[PDB]
Amino acid sequence: TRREAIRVLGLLGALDPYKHKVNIEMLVNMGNLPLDEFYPAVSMVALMRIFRDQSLSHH
Amino acid sequence: VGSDPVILATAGYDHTVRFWQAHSGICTRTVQHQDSQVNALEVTPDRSMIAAAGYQHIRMYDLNSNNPNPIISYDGVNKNIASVGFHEDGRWMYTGGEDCTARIWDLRSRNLQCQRIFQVNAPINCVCLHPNQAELIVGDQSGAIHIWDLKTDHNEQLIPEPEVSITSAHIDPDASYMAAVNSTGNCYVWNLTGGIGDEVTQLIPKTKIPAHTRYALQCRFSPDSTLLATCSADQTCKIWRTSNFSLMTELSIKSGNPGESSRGWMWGCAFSGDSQYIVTASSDNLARLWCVETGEIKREYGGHQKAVVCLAFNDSV
Amino acid sequence: WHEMWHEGLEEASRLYFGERNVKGMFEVLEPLHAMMERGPQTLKETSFNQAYGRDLMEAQEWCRKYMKSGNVKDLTQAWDLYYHVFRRISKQLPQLTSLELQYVSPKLLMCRDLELAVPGTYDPNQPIIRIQSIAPSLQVITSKQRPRKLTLMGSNGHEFVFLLKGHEDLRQDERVMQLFGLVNTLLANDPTSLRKNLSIQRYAVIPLSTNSGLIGWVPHCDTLHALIRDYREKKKILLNIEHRIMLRMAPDYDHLTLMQKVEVFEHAVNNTAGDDLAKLLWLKSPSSEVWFDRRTNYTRSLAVMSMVGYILGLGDRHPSNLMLDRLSGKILHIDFGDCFEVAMTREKFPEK
Amino acid sequence: STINLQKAWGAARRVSKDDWLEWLRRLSLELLKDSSSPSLRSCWALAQAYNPMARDLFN
Amino acid sequence: ECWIDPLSMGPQKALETIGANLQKQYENWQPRARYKQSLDPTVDEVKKLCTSLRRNAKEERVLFHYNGHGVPRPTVNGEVWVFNKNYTQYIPLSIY
Numbered sequence: 001t002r003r004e005a006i007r008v009l010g011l012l013g014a015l016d017p018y019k020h021k022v023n024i025e026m027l028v029n030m031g032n033l034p035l036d037e038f039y040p041a042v043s044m045v046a047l048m049r050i051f052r053d054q055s056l057s058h059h
Numbered sequence: 060v061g062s063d064p065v066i067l068a069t070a071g072y073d074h075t076v077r078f079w080q081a082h083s084g085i086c087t088r089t090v091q092h093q094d095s096q097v098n099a100l101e102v103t104p105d106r107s108m109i110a111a112a113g114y115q116h117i118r119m120y121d122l123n124s125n126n127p128n129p130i131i132s133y134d135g136v137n138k139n140i141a142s143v144g145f146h147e148d149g150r151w152m153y154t155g156g157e158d159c160t161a162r163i164w165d166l167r168s169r170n171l172q173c174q175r176i177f178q179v180n181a182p183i184n185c186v187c188l189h190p191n192q193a194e195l196i197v198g199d200q201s202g203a204i205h206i207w208d209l210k211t212d213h214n215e216q217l218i219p220e221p222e223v224s225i226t227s228a229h230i231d232p233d234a235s236y237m238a239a240v241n242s243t244g245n246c247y248v249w250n251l252t253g254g255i256g257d258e259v260t261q262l263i264p265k266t267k268i269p270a271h272t273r274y275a276l277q278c279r280f281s282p283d284s285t286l287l288a289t290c291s292a293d294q295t296c297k298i299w300r301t302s303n304f305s306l307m308t309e310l311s312i313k314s315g316n317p318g319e320s321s322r323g324w325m326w327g328c329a330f331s332g333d334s335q336y337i338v339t340a341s342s343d344n345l346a347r348l349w350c351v352e353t354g355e356i357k358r359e360y361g362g363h364q365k366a367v368v369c370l371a372f373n374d375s376v
Numbered sequence: 377w378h379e380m381w382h383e384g385l386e387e388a389s390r391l392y393f394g395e396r397n398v399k400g401m402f403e404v405l406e407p408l409h410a411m412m413e414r415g416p417q418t419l420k421e422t423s424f425n426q427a428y429g430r431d432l433m434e435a436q437e438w439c440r441k442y443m444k445s446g447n448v449k450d451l452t453q454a455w456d457l458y459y460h461v462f463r464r465i466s467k468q469l470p471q472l473t474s475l476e477l478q479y480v481s482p483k484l485l486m487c488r489d490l491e492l493a494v495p496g497t498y499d500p501n502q503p504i505i506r507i508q509s510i511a512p513s514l515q516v517i518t519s520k521q522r523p524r525k526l527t528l529m530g531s532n533g534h535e536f537v538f539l540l541k542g543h544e545d546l547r548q549d550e551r552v553m554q555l556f557g558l559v560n561t562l563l564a565n566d567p568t569s570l571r572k573n574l575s576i577q578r579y580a581v582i583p584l585s586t587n588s589g590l591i592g593w594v595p596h597c598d599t600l601h602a603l604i605r606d607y608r609e610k611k612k613i614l615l616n617i618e619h620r621i622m623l624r625m626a627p628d629y630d631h632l633t634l635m636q637k638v639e640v641f642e643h644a645v646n647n648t649a650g651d652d653l654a655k656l657l658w659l660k661s662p663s664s665e666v667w668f669d670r671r672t673n674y675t676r677s678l679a680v681m682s683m684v685g686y687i688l689g690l691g692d693r694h695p696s697n698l699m700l701d702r703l704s705g706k707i708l709h710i711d712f713g714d715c716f717e718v719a720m721t722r723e724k725f726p727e728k
Numbered sequence: 729s730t731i732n733l734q735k736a737w738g739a740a741r742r743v744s745k746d747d748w749l750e751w752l753r754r755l756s757l758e759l760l761k762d763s764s765s766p767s768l769r770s771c772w773a774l775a776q777a778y779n780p781m782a783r784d785l786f787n
Numbered sequence: 788e789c790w791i792d793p794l795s796m797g798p799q800k801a802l803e804t805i806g807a808n809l810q811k812q813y814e815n816w817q818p819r820a821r822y823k824q825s826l827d828p829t830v831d832e833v834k835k836l837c838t839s840l841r842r843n844a845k846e847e848r849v850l851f852h853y854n855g856h857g858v859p860r861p862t863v864n865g866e867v868w869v870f871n872k873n874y875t876q877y878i879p880l881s882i883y
Contacts, residue, residue, distance in 0.1 A: 018570075018571050025662070026662075026784070026787070027662040027663060028662050030787075031659065031660065031662070036765075039765040039767045039768055040767045042784075042785065043767045043768060043770075043771055043785065045784075046771070046781060046784040046785055047771070047774075049780075049784070050774075050778070050781065055778075058777075059774060059777055059778060072626050072627065072628055095628065095631060096626075096628045096631065096632065098633060114628075114631045139631065139633055141633060157633065157634070182634075200634070224634075226635060242635075274635070274638070276635065292638075292639065320646035320647070321642060321643045321646040321647070324639050326635075342639065365625075365626065366625070366626065368636065470797075471796065471797040471800060473797070
């Protein structure tokens with residue numbers, strides 16, 4: 001299978017990287033605030049990610 | 060100052076003009092210079108009063124009387140006066156400025172307005188009176204040296220090197236060679252053809268001396284005409300022998316340590332009456348009386364709060 | 377009105393007290409009197425004519441008495457009233473931080489879902505993004521000219537911010553933006569340039585009169601001067617340190633000769649680490665990988681505008697006239713008031 | 729509150745990826761428990777349950 | 788505040804305007820009275836103000852209007868907050 005996946009990249013040619021480009025905050029948080037404010041803000045941001053999706057159901 | 064045979068004036072950004080003593084190293088008298096700095100001093104051949112070219116005024120202070128106000132304040136100019144000459148008879152006075160307009164001022168006449176004018180293209184960096192008292196060499200920022208004749212007005216423009224500002228140029232008292240200096244740091248020497256009545260004054264290029272790496276600032280022959288001191292922004296005052304154009308002695312005021320940036324530019328070179336001593340001003344606020352042959356700091360002059368850009372030296376009896 | 381009267385009396389004072397041009401002084405002021413001769417069309421114009429308008433009309437009586445008498449005591453009474461309202465206006469102007477549509481122009485507040493499209497957005501291919509509604513508040517920028525910060529709601533739903541400049545002819549800027557369009561086309565066509573993603577950042581320019589017009593506000597930007605000021609106050613560095621070092625070594629800097637200036641300038645450079653912009657680009661960037669990409673764009677964009685500016689002749693590029701995109705990293709040039717080597721020609725402070 | 733930390737630090741008996749990954753987890757959780765700011769200390773229980781939470785508050 | 792948005796007019800002008808309007812508002816009910824505004828006053832300023840109005844009408848009623856919306860709440864110890872000369876510190880003022 002890996003052999004075919006290469007043989008097919010061969011036949012399709014080698015695309016120029018530019019031609020493929022056409023075809024296709026946490027540090028910032030700390031960059032601004034003092035540490036006593038930063039700690040709530042970073043805690044909340046990390047909690048909000050868990051809040052969305054079905055991961056919240058487990059926790 | 061005046062009664063003393065030797066003169067050694069000094070002036071810079073601190074608005075003073077301190078008259079030192081060569082034998083001692085003591086400030087005899089200062090003179091105030093408000094409203095500007097001093098760009099170039101000049102003792103008069105008569106030695107009655109010194110000159111001090113500044114910003115939009117050629118002032119002339121008294122050498123005999125002490126603590127006087129400026130006797131003459133020649134106004135009516137702009138953009139500074141780079142240098143000032145003086146006719147050996149003591150009647151005419153020459154100047155050069157950045158206004159691209161050389162001038163001549165009659166000291167004897169009371170008229171405020173000047174007498175003659177020789178306008179040029181680019182700002183005038185330096186004046187130098189030819190010893191024959193008939194030709195006035197005039198450098199400029201574009202590179203063009205001129206020889207404005209004082210009788211025929213036939214300026215013979217000449218460019219040693221294109222697009223390099225020539226900052227100073229001097230000619231020895233015997234009219235043999237003429238030296239020039241530019242912001243590249245070369246020292247173009249020119250052999251003077253022996254013409255007085257003919258006024259041919261042909262400049263024969265002899266040697267391009269690679270004097271300094273960085274901007275050179277002043278060149279001046281000795282009264283002997285054996286040595287050619289050449290100051291630069293590299294904090295070294297080299298002395299070139301006239302015969303061979305070789306570096307006899309290199310007087311440097313460097314720190315002797317890589318951790319010392321911009322200690323101060325060296326732009327003072329006044330030879331002694333017999334080429335035994337050499338005065339030298341520096342931007343480290345200190346004048347230095349060097350020895351020519353040995354290369355040793357004989358005396359050190361201190362007390363200037365700011366940098367020291369000018370020198371005066373007169374051993375005329 | 378109070379802004380027009382303010383600039384008018386400044387010009388009239390220069391004619392009278394400066395040049396002693398009295399007939400030209402009346403030529404400056406008489407349009408402003410005819411301007412108010414329309415009458416109060418908005419509440420702001422009512423409160424102006426209430427407070428000042430009475431005094432201006434009285435000063436006009438002394439001006440009209442001078443026209444048929446020719447007395448210094450007649451015209452000085454007008455200048456007393458003129459300087460009275462001028463000082464009151466001059467005190468007011470700093471307080472005008474924002475203007476509400478209800479006061480300044482309620483017509484615009486009424487305007488809803490206009491068919492007239494957002495300026496400089498119209499494309500023959502794209503669908504017309506017509507004006508949805510105008511925001512009620514106008515954040516007046518505190519500058520010498522006091523530009524406004526207009527913001528319009530599009531029919532597509534996105535907000536469009538603009539900069540309403542007054543008494544600054546924008547036909548030059550409009551023409552210059554046509555030039556940048558051409559150059560961008562050429563760079564797109566060249567493959568080498570396209571591979572490097574070279575392009576000039578441009579913005580909409582829409583003139584409205586000989587004086588006023590709309591400039592498109594570029595988001596995520598801030599002037600280079602602001603960045604250096606804010607970095608140096610954070611790091612407790614003196615904002616004017618280079619200038620202070622020069623004046624300390626040689627207080628006569630302005631009047632010094634060329635060689636002297638070079639020394640003074642170099643002395644400042646040797647005793648100041650000139651890394652403030654590089655250093656702050658690092659700290660601002662969230663991560664090194666982004667930082668590198670921001671710097672690549674920064675370097676190329678600068679080179680592109682260096683060459684284009686040289687050909688166009690764009691001078692007077694002090695750090696207040698160029699701003700840096702804090703996301704893309706590309707440099708932006710604005711306020712092309714000086715072109716075709718005007719700076720070199722002018723005698724005062726010539727730029728080489 | 730730096731005894732368990734010093735055990736996590738000077739263990740260096742890890743001869744695989746998951747061994748160091750286990751070291752990391754112990755290190756992160758000990759820093760949260762220690763942390764003076766209670767907004768971070770409050771997240772310690774979640775970090776034990778969820779590895780991503782520990783990594784988001786690592787810095 | 789007194790039917791005036793203080794942030795619309797800028798800080799200093801708004802404070803003067805509210806004092807002027809409040810005077811007018813009171814002049815609806817008592818138009819013939821000496822009004823004397825004090826706008827973010829000091830302690831001496833309050834002393835000199837009250838003592839002057841008390842001197843004017845020693846035996847007659849004098850109205851003291853206090854609006855402490857900009858200062859912290861009064862303390863249990865019977866104190867009311869005012870400002871310092873520099874407007875950098877809330878100075879307490881004893882009710883006694």
